[model samples]
Target: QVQLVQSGAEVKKPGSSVKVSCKASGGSSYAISWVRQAPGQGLEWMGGIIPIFGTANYAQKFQGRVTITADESTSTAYMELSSLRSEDTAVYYCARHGNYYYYSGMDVWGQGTTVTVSSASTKGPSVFPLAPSSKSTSGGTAALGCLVKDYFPEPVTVSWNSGALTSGVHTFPAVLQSSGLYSLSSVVTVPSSSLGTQTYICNVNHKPSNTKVDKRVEP
Candidate 1:
């Protein structure tokens, strides 16, 4: 029963560097392996690190710009990306592995850390309304997902019911796609009854370009 918690999202300028931390507890967390996922892309193995002995392994594509380090005492692992560009904007996740990793099997994965490389260019966001789902748990709450795609500068803000959002909302970091644009996914939980359907509205605010979009959901 190992738990892996990662650091928060980061917005960095091009050519800068950012570090993401992964703290582990409860199980066989001898080593940590890092993985990368670009926006609308599959997963890619980045590297691994053994905290006790400071040993590490890196993939050929990530050797120079990516570094994996760890602190043995605190059971914490770190992945740092340097000389960041628009292409380097992706989600980084750390997983638990064994000490000697020829091909380490990552057992437990961290929540994920998003590193947004904000470029000088700007483009408005496109909002895509995802299908909503509802279930009966505690008087029923519907989960609505909103997809914001093809935006630049990574300064988009999202809300629900036409106002600012505070709780029961989970938003990921802006992801960079191969087309040189960014995308993000956010889900908001709204109160819905166990029986009939309820309506909810989502708002996407692309502040840099002063663009706003609204998405409606009935779940």
Candidate 2:
């Protein structure tokens, strides 16, 4: 029943300041942390504030540029950014942090508030070409790899489909990149007899945006 509600998006100039808020409901025992993801960049731990204790900690990189505060009576956490730059443009998120193992990371997170700096444009996920480890033109076996890169809104779903009648298919979870986007890889092995005239498809689905991208085999 715990929820972290975030403020709306903001578009600011290079010299201005912006303050965003996150309101907590259902409980106030947990600490609240602020995280930021710059445009086409990875997530950075800005800092966190303990409403109960009225204390805070900031990452070395974000120490001077950002400030973290909390209002105990209202059970709310605030993040303020000053002297913005193009590099400061990113999506901000607030999450609840706890001491327990299950709450090791930001467990409950608010929907990110996108902040655009210097008129940055929104971009969708990028799907790379599916490449095979080895080419088998005359019915031979080979391993193929599919990749989906630079996606936003947190999670991305990647699925594979093929007409070559493969024998083994393995998929791994999407990995977060330093750019705060995600990259996923899936490998499928085709038997010697099923390698001819086969087309493998890699489909990437971005749940938050309801967007999908498909990549077919190139070999």
Q: Each model's TM-score?
A: 0.58, 0.52
- Please provide, for model 2 over 96-126, each residue's C-alpha lDDT reduced to its tens digit, 9 standing for 90 to 100: 8764222366679998888755532234677
Which has the greatest lDDT? 1
Query: Model 2 RMSD to the real structure?
Result: 7.6
Q: Compose the digit string of candidate 1's lDDT tens values, residues 41-100.
A: 999888888766667888988779988887767878888888888788799888886545
Off by over 4 Å in 2: 100-103, 119-219
Clashes of each: 0, 5
Candidate 2: 10-residue stretch with minimal lDDT: 130-139
By TM-score, the best candidate is: 1
TM-score of 1: 0.58
- Compared with the true structure, the alpha-carbon lDDT of candidate 1 equals 0.77
